[PDB]
C-alpha cells in the first residue's frame, strides 16, 4: 500500500525520499514508481504542457510506496497504471444497490429494501472506491446477523436492541454499532463522538478510520 504527497515550492526530489525513508538513495525507485522523466519536478507549470503525463510541477500529487513494495517490479508496473486512482485497488469496485437513500432510510430493518440501478445509459451502475466503502458498511449494518445464506455471522444484532429508552440500553446500541463496524478489515477502528436520546429517537454519531 501507499501514501499521497503534494509537491511544494522548488521541492527537491531527493527531499521527498529522505523525508519518508531516511536515506536519500531510494529516489531512483520512487521516480520509477511514478513514471517520471528526468525533469522530476519543475517550478514553471508551462513546462508541464509539453509532456503532462511524464512531467510533474508544484502542487501536483505523487505516489509514495511503503518500504516493502519499493523494489517490486510488479508493484512498480501497477503503480504506473493506477496513478491517483490507486485507492480503487484497496477499497474495490462493486455494484450499486442504493437506488435512493431517500427510500431505505425511512423503512429501516426489513426484507425487500435495496435494489440494483443504472447510472448513465446501458452500463450497469458500478460504485467504486470510497463510494463502495459507504455501501459496504451501510448494506452490512442493515442486515441482521443470522441472515445471509452463506458465511453466517454477517450482519448485526441491531434489530434486537429496541428496548427501554434508558441510558444503559443506549450504550448497548453503541456497542453493537462499534462491534459491527470494526468487523471488516478495511476499517482500522471506530469510536463514538456523541449521542442524543430524544423521547423515542436514538441519535448518535461515530468515526471510522477507513484505510487510505
Amino acid at each position: 500500500r501507499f501514501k499521497k504527497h503534494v509537491v511544494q515550492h522548488e521541492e527537491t526530489m531527493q527531499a521527498i525520499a529522505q523525508r519518508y525513508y531516511g536515506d536519500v538513495s531510494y529516489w531512483i525507485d520512487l521516480v520509477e514508481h511514478n513514471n517520471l522523466k528526468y525533469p522530476y519536478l519543475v517550478e514553471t507549470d508551462e513546462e508541464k504542457m509539453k509532456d503532462p503525463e511524464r512531467l510533474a510541477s508544484t502542487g501536483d500529487t505523487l505516489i509514495i510506496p511503503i518500504e516493502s513494495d519499493l523494489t517490486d517490479v510488479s508493484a512498480k508496473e501497477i503503480n504506473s497504471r493506477d496513478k491517483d486512482v490507486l485507492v480503487e485497488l484497496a477499497l474495490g469496485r462493486d455494484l450499486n444497490i442504493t437506488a435512493d437513500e431517500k427510500y431505505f432510510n425511512e423503512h429501516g430493518t426489513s426484507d425487500n429494501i435495496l435494489a440494483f440501478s443504472t447510472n448513465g445509459n446501458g452500463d450497469l451502475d458500478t460504485v467504486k472506491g470510497i463510494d463502495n466503502m459507504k455501501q459496504q458498511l451501510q448494506a452490512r449494518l442493515l442486515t441482521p446477523r443470522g441472515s445471509l445464506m452463506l458465511h453466517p455471522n454477517y450482519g448485526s444484532d441491531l434489530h434486537n436492541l429496541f428496548g427501554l429508552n434508558i441510558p444503559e440500553q443506549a450504550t448497548l446500541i453503541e456497542m453493537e454499532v462499534l462491534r459491527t463496524l470494526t468487523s471488516d478489515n478495511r476499517v482500522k477502528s471506530a469510536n463514538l463522538i456523541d449521542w442524543k436520546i430524544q423521547g423515542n429517537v436514538y441519535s448518535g454519531q461515530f468515526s471510522v478510520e477507513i484505510k487510505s
Binding site: E10, R19, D45, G59, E101, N105, E106, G108, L137
Partner: protein, 538 residues
Amino acid sequence: TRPHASIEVDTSGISEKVFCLIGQAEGGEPNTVYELRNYSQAKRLFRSGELLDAIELAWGSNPNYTAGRILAMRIEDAKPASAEIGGLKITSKIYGNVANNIQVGLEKNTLSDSLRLRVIFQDDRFNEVYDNIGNIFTIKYKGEEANATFSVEHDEETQKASRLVLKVGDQEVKSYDLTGGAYDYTNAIITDINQLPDFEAKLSPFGDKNLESSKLDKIENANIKDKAVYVKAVFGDLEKQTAYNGIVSFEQLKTIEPFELTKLKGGTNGEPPATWADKLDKFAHEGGYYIVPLSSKQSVHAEVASFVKERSDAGEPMRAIVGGGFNESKEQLFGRQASLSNPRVSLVANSGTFVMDDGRKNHVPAYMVAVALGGLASGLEIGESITFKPLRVSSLDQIYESIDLDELNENGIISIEFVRNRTNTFFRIVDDVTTFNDKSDPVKAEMAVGEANDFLVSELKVQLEDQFIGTRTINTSASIIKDFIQSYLGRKKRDNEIQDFPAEDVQVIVEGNEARISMTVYPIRSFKKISVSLVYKQ
C-alpha cells in the same frame, strides 16, 4: 411513520471564536447574514466565486489547526429570476444570474383532465415532473332519480370556496359551508358525503392531499351519475405538489393556463456596490471578532478600518486583516499603510497559490491570503500568536526576501517567509505586527498581546459590573475592592491567563459617586528573541 433504523454516511466536512467574511459570490439571498458550520453547507447556500473559495481556504490553511464557525455576507444586490407567464407569477428561490437557466412549462392531460408540470435547471441536474394537478377528489351519485349533479360556489368578495351543494334535480339533497366551519380540512367532506345514502366520494391514490377547503374552484351542476367526475381545485394543489422541494415558487396574479416550456428572466447580480459600509453595519451584533473584506479597493479598507474602531468604542473589540492587489510594490504598500496607520488593523503583502481541493492549482490574490491567515489566527487558543507558525500555501508570487523582511516588518506589514525544508510547507509567517505606527507599546503593536488583552479586559469589566456597578449599596468601601480584585487576579494567575501579578501594588480611591482603581499585571506573550550563549573551560 412506523418504527425503523437509519444510517446516513454524512458528507459533512468531506473551536471557540467566530470569523467574519464579506465578499463577492454568485448565490444566496442578499443583505442577510448566515452562520456556516459545515463546508458542505456552504456549497449549497452559495455556489461559486471568492466568498466560497475563501471559506474552502479558511477551514484548511493548516493540517492540525483550523478556523471556527464563519459568518458570511454577500456584497451584491442580486434580484431573483422571475417571469409572468400564464396567470402565474413564477419566482425562483435562487437570487442572481444563475437563476436565468431555469425552465418552467405546463401541459394538460386529456386522459385525466389535469395539468402536468415540469421544472428544469441545469447546474443542479434538476429535471422532474408533477402530474395529476387538481383531481383532488371524485364523486359518484348512486340514487335512481333521472340525473343528479353537484355545485361549488365561490365567495364573490374573495374568490374563495363558499359552499358545496348536492342537487338531485331541483332539490338540494345536502350542503356544506366552506368558508371555515366544520370542514376546514377536506377530510370531513370525505366522510360527510359517503355517510349519506345516495352519494359516495373517494380520493385519488397519489398521495395524501387533504387540502384546506377554501381552495376549491367555482363549478355548477356537474353530472355525476353517468360519470365519476373530479373536483378540480387546480391552483392550491400546486403547494402540496411542489412547495417543499426544488428551486421554483408560484404565486397568483385570474385563471391558470397551460404554456410552453419557457425560460425565466431578470436574474441579475447587478452592479457592484460603490460602498461597503451600509452592509458592513449588519455584523455589529452577530458576535464576530476577526473580519476580512474580500477586495483590494482602498475605499473598502478605509471603511472597514473605521468600522472596527467604531465597534471597539462601543464595548465590542474587533480586528481586521487586509491584503491588496496582485503582487504589490513597496511604494504601493507603504502608500496603503500610511493612509491606514491605525491599530486593530494588519496589512499582508504576498499573493500566493493554493492547491484547492478540486485539484485546482489556484493562483490567489493578497486579500485571500489574508483569509487564510485570519482563519488560522482565529482558530488558535487565546493568547497564542501566528508568530513562526506554518501555512499550507503551495507557492508565492513574491519579491520580498530576508532583508526586505526587515524593511516591511519594521514598518508594520506582515509577510510569509520561505524556509527550504522539513518545516511542513516550507513556509512560515514572520511576525504578528499591526499597522499602527509606534511599535514601542506591545498592546497596540503586536496582535497576539492585544487579542489576549481584549478578552481579559471584557471579563474584568463584566465581573466588576454586577458586583459594584449594580450599585447594590454604598456601604462597601475601597478596602473591599482590593479584596475582590486581588481575588480576581489570583484566579487569572492560577488559570495561566496572565504570567504573574504583584498583589501588594494595588491602589484604590473612592468618593462615593465614583471609584478609581490602579493595578499592575505582568503579561504573557510568545517568545521572539532567543539569545543562548556558550562558554567553556577549554
